[PDB]
Structure formats: structure tokens, C-alpha cells
Amino acid sequence: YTRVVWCAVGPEEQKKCQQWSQQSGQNVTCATASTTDDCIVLVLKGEADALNLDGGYIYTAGKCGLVPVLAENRKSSKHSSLDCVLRPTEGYLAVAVVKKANEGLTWNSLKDKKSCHTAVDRTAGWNIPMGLIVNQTGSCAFDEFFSQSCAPGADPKSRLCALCAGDDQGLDKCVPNSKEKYYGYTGAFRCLAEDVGDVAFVKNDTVWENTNGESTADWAKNLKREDFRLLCLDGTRKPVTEAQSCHLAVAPNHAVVSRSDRAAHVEQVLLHQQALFGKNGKNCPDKFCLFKSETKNLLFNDNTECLAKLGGRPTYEEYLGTEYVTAIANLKKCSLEACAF
């Protein structure tokens, strides 16, 4: 009832969820699945209540009747007065990032190069860049465009997984969960940083959070912002400070979804959970911080300031916006009134 079952994707999120569970006095409990799609199915069956999803998955979930409940909100600049929970979301910038040293690589010479994607079906890592590439190429053979990639969630024996590395034992290659070394925003940026790929499709924030000492992780220690460039759609390369004028799209923020019949209850529990474990929460950083996990973005993104209420009781189509929704519909004609399960 006032007990919510959260769905965790893979073993590291499970571990974080368990801690949250313990600290919440079991107001929150945990179910675990190997992929986000499987978590969506748990939610449909009523065996889990909720999870926080990237926009590409909100589209999947939406067709099956799930609804957005609250949205990640990061630090803003305009609307200084408003409380975080009431502040409108701004959205993130999807970018394509390369090494400065890889000169003469631009948007127009990406063909046959190596790519790093957060996961198949995700906004910045897949839907935006592959949608543009299909568009520009006039062809649904997006699996042939790059020579090799790491795109968690594709066929492990395909060239889309050739660059994925699996877990510290080499198992679970290309699975779309954090066990895969190059999964997610951080994984795809690591894939570029280690020069496994030529380009990473991530968001603007990922570059800043993993360079110039912001990350203490071994692979990101010595990374410098100046060693990276953004690829712009006009064929130019720009410094990472110019993301405002050099992105592939603005993406809708990740948001918590649930079955509509459970939305109201998930919302109230979460609002109270963040008062306890959120940014300035009563027990964070004392006992547990919901929005921390050492740059690994477990359950929620680490840069989340709060979960915010949605202005308008959005359907998922309204939450995603008509320009994003049509982009996805078009790309999925290669790979409408449905539910995949």
C-alpha cells in the first residue's frame, strides 16, 4: 500500500535498492530484473510498482499503458525562486563526442567508424543519433553504418556488440545493464575515453562529470575537457563548452513511471522518500543518499537535484513531446498502436 516495490536493473542497482529498502524501514522494497524491458513487464504484471526510465523506454512503457509520475530535475539557472519539486524540467542535451586528437572526424565522416552507445532504445545513445542517420542515409540498415560498436541490448554476435566488454570476468557481454563495462552514459563515455570507439553518443552533462577531476575513477582521473570535441550537425567541431550551439537534440528528462492505477500512491511515497534521502534530505548524507552512487547513475542519475511534479498530468505522449515521439515512431519503422509484450 504505502509500500512500493521498486524495480532494479541488474545486480548493482539491486544492491543500492536493498540499502534504500533497509533505510526506509521497508516502505520501499525491491524486485530485480536483468533488463529494463523485463522490469517494465514486472510492473505490468503488478509484481513491481515503479522505476525511473530514460525517455526511449518511457515510449515503450507508454504504449503498454504505463504513465509518467515524477521527473528527474537537475540544477537550473532561470526560475530561481521555485522549489525544485515545483520547477519545470528543462531537458538534457544529446551530443556526439570525439577526441580532439582524432582530427578531421566530423558528423559527415562517421560512416565506418567505431561507435559507443548507452544502450539500444535510449534517447541520446540510440534514438536521436540512429534516427538522424537513418534519415540522412535514406536506409534502415543502421546496423551497417558503423564498422563496430558497443550498443548494449543488440545481438551479442553482431558488430553492434563487437566493442562491448562484458563484466570483470568477460561474461554478460553487451547486456543492457551496468554489469556491461560500457553500458550507460558513463560506460559509453568510458568507451570513447579508452579509445575503444571513435565517437560516444551521450549527454552534455556526462562530459563535465567525468573530466577535470570531477570523477575520481581510475579511467577518468586524468581526463581533460579540452581533449574532447562535440560534433555539430553542420559539419563543425566545437569545444564542450558550446553544447548550447552544438547538440543533436534536447531530450526529455528521465522520469519515474508506474501503472496508472498505482500512480498516485507511488507519487506520495516518493515525495516523502526524497524529503528523507534527497539532496538536502534529513538522512542524507548521514545514512543514505538516494541520488548518489559514485558516478554510476544507479536507479537515478547522480546529478539529480530532486524528483519534480509534472505540470499538466501528462500523458506519456505529452511528456515526451510530439517532436520526440515522431522521431521514435519513424525509426521504429525500421526495427505504432502496440505494446511489444
Ligand SMILES: *[C@@H]1O[C@H](CO)[C@@H](O[C@@H]2O[C@H](CO)[C@@H](O[C@H]3O[C@H](CO)[C@@H](O[C@@H]4O[C@H](CO)[C@@H](O)[C@H](O)[C@@H]4O)[C@H](O)[C@@H]3O)[C@H](O)[C@H]2NC(C)=O)[C@H](O)[C@H]1NC(C)=O
Ligand atoms: C552541460 O552540463 C554541465 C554539467 O551539468 C553544466 O554545467 C553546470 O552548470 C551549472 C549551472 O547551470 C553549475 O551550477 C553551479 O554549481 C556549483 C554550486 O552552485 C558551482 O560549482 C561547483 O562547485 C562544486 C565544488 O565542490 C562542485 O560540486 C561542482 O563540480 C562545481 O565545481 C557553480 O559555480 C555553479 O553555481 C554547475 O557547477 C555546472 N556543473 C559542472 C560540473 O560544471 C552545463 O551548464 C551544461 N551546459 C549546457 C549548455 O547545458
Ligand SMILES: *[C@@H]1O[C@H](CO)[C@@H](O[C@@H]2O[C@H](CO)[C@@H](O[C@@H]3O[C@H](CO)[C@@H](O)[C@H](O)[C@@H]3O)[C@H](O)[C@H]2NC(C)=O)[C@H](O)[C@H]1NC(C)=O
Ligand atoms: C526523420 O525524418 C522524418 C520524416 O520527415 C521526420 O518526421 C517528421 O518530423 C517533423 C518535425 O517533427 C513533422 O512535422 C511537424 O508537424 C507539426 C504539425 O503540423 C508542426 O507543428 C511542426 O512544426 C512540424 O512541421 C513531420 O510530421 C514528421 N514527418 C512524418 C513522416 O511523420 C523525423 O523527425 C526525422 N527524424 C529525426 C530524428 O529528425
Ligand SMILES: OCC1O[C@H](O[C@@H]2OC(CO)[C@@H](O)[C@H](O)[C@H]2O)[C@H](O)[C@@H](O)[C@@H]1O
Ligand atoms: O524535448 C524537450 C522537452 O520537452 C518535454 O515535454 C514537452 O515538450 C513539448 C513540445 O516539444 C511540449 O509539448 C510540452 O509541453 C513539453 O513540456 C520534456 O519532457 C522535457 O523534459 C524536455 O526537455
Ligand SMILES: *[C@@H]1O[C@H](CO)[C@@H](O)[C@H](O)[C@H]1NC(C)=O
Ligand atoms: C514509512 O512510511 C510510513 C507511512 O507514511 C511513515 O509513517 C514513516 O515515516 C515511513 N518511514 C520511513 C523511514 O520512511
Ligand SMILES: [Fe+3]
Ligand atoms: Fe537518457
Ligand SMILES: [Zn+2]
Ligand atoms: Zn537545439
Ligand SMILES: [Zn+2]
Ligand atoms: Zn494533457
